[PDB]
From Swiss-Prot, chains A, B:
Gene3D superfamilies for the chain: Winged helix-like DNA-binding domain superfamily/Winged helix DNA-binding domain
Keyword Transcription: yes
Induction field: Expression is modulated by temperature, growth phase, salt and pH.
Ranges in a coiled coil: none
DNA-binding region: 45-68
The species this protein was found in: Escherichia coli O127:H6 (strain E2348/69 / EPEC)
Name listed for the protein in its UniProt record: Transcriptional regulator HosA
Length: 131, 131
């Protein structure tokens, strides 16, 4: 189709289909949340919304599941228990460390079809299009 | 972030957030399904999966809801009732006709930030990346 955002969703679906086959227990939003916590241990939960590309409700559901699976621990602001700080557990570090080369490989199946200049330009257009 | 597919999901989330504000009762996958039925009235349901970018389960759920809202009608293969043909109803035509300029406008908020050459190239890279 000639609609750029339709073809973009089609590319996204192919990338998601490969991701779910290679990492059946870690979606891309879950993976991004773990990468963002690892990049800033103790990050505020609210700041983790933008860092991982999520929403308040979706992140809350996601962190509850990771917490129940021993992958994430959280602490609270004593002045405001609605504020929370997030760390990866040791098990969460192992899960993320094993997933990174897999996620990189899935990304590479698509980005590797582009030259370095094409990859840089693709990124530039996406940022140019964003608000 | 330097990950192209992370920034791409961020662009997708912004585009989805605008879409849901302007068309609160018609998501992009629902809109694409209606556009594909209108482009080929009587299209086989199975062929509508690729045309609208969906899955068998998701399309089945989606067409059931549209059918229950008087937006879609379906007919069956007499030899194999699992095969189905899909049409828009008159109400479905009106819903789609009203939605098209809205969806175009939402697309334009992002694509309009690119020149015609940048838009053509963005599309070319996406197709180059797809399988
Ligand atoms: Cl917080
Ligand atoms: Cl069918």
């Amino acid at each position: 189709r000639n609609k750029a955002f339709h073809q973009l969703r089609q590319l996204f679906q192919q990338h998601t289909a490969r991701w779910q086959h290679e990492l059946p227990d870690l979606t891309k939003p879950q993976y991004a949340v773990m990468r963002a916590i690892a990049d800033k241990p103790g990050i505020e939960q609210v700041a983790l919304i933008e860092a991982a590309v999520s929403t308040k409700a979706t992140l809350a559901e996601m962190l509850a599941r990771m917490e129940n699976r021993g992958l994430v621990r959280r602490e609270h602001d004593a002045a405001d228990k609605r504020r929370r700080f997030v760390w990866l557990t040791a098990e969460g570090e192992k899960v993320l460390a094993a997933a990174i080369p897999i996620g990189d490989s899935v990304d590479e199946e698509f980005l590797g079809r582009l030259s370095a200049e094409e990859q840089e330009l693709f990124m530039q257009l996406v940022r140019k299009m964003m608000n």
